[PDB]
UniProtKB/Swiss-Prot annotation, chain A:
Residue ranges occupied by any PFU domain in the UniProt entry: 1-80
Residues represented out of the complete protein: 386 to 465 of 795
Name the record gives this protein: Phospholipase A-2-activating protein
Stated family: Belongs to the WD repeat PLAP family.
Associated disorder: Neurodevelopmental disorder with progressive microcephaly, spasticity, and brain anomalies: An autosomal recessive neurodevelopmental disorder characterized by progressive microcephaly, spastic quadriparesis, global developmental delay, profound intellectual disability and severely impaired or absent motor function. More variable features include seizures and optic atrophy.
Compartments where found: Nucleus; Cytoplasm; Synapse
Function of the molecule: Plays a role in protein ubiquitination, sorting and degradation through its association with VCP. Involved in ubiquitin-mediated membrane proteins trafficking to late endosomes in an ESCRT-dependent manner, and hence plays a role in synaptic vesicle recycling. May play a role in macroautophagy, regulating for instance the clearance of damaged lysosomes. Plays a role in cerebellar Purkinje cell development.
Quaternary structure, from the entry: Interacts with ubiquitin. Interacts with UBXN6, VCP and YOD1; may form a complex involved in macroautophagy.
Domain observations: The PUL domain is composed of 6 armadillo-like repeats and mediates the interaction with VCP C-terminus.
Reported induction: Up-regulated by tumor necrosis factor alpha (TNF-alpha) (at protein level).
Gene: PLAA
UniProtKB/Swiss-Prot annotation, chain B:
Domain Ubiquitin-like per the UniProt entry, residue ranges: 1-76
Post-translational modification: Phosphorylated at Ser-65 by PINK1 during mitophagy. Phosphorylated ubiquitin specifically binds and activates parkin (PRKN), triggering mitophagy. Phosphorylation does not affect E1-mediated E2 charging of ubiquitin but affects discharging of E2 enzymes to form polyubiquitin chains. It also affects deubiquitination by deubiquitinase enzymes such as USP30.
Annotated site (Essential for function): H68
Residues with PTM ADP-ribosylglycine: G76
Gene for this chain: UBA52
Annotated site residue numbers, Interacts with activating enzyme: R54, R72
Result when mutating K63R: Abolishes HLTF-mediated polyubiquitination of PCNA
Species name: Homo sapiens (Human)
Lineage, uppermost ranks: Eukaryota, Metazoa, Chordata, Craniata, Vertebrata
Subcellular location: Cytoplasm; Nucleus
Cross-link (Glycyl lysine isopeptide (Lys-Gly) (interchain with G-Cter in ubiquitin)): K6, K11, K27, K29, K33, K48, K63
Name of the molecule in the record: Ubiquitin
PTM-bearing positions, type Phosphoserine: S65
Outcome recorded upon mutating G76A: Loss of ADP-ribosylation
Domain of life the protein comes from: Eukaryota
Complete-protein stretch covered: 1 to 76 of 128
Length: 80, 76
């Protein structure tokens, strides 16, 4: 029901569709990558990459997860 | 010591190695258990990738820390 903000992920005071905890560091800034149901892995990853300033090497790591978010290899897997 | 490695899908696996063990041997043990090639296997810790010529004490790895086990995009 579109009444309570339970049908959305409120991270750092921002509502988004899906969020991925980027545990790249222990004991510091808890990076959380926000993804919407209408974006492209490399695009959304790049947006966050330059949002909190992250090294391009992490782009591949985060993109891989977003790619299967709406694919079906290990996350939403099923009938091929 | 044992380290907790987290795969891309969030799979958590514990690897038993020695403090004087190089990351290359650690990768070999993972290639022995799961079978993941040490070449494509990319280990990221604290934002830095673990090199082969490095030991556990090299990166000052904390006992039972979170190691990120991912793959690679560019093959060449």
């Amino acid at each position: 029901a579109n009444q309570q903000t339970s049908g959305k992920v409120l991270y750092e005071g921002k509502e988004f569709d899906y969020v991925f905890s980027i545990d790249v560091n222990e004991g510091g800034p808890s990076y959380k990558l926000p993804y919407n149901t209408s974006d492209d892995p490399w695009l959304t990853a790049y947006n966050f990459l330059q949002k909190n300033d992250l090294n391009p090497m992490f782009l591949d790591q985060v993109a891989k997860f977003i790619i299967d978010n709406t694919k079906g290899q290990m996350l939403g897997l099923g009938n091929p | 010591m044992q380290i907790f490695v987290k795969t891309l899908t969030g799979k958590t696996i514990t690897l038993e190695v020695e403090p004087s063990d190089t990351i290359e041997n650690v990768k070999a043990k993972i290639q022995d258990k799961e079978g993941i090639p040490p070449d494509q296997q990319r280990l990221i810790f604290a934002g830095k990738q673990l090199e082969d010529g490095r030991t556990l004490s090299d990166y000052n790895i904390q006992k039972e820390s979170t190691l990120h086990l991912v793959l690679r995009l560019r093959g060449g």
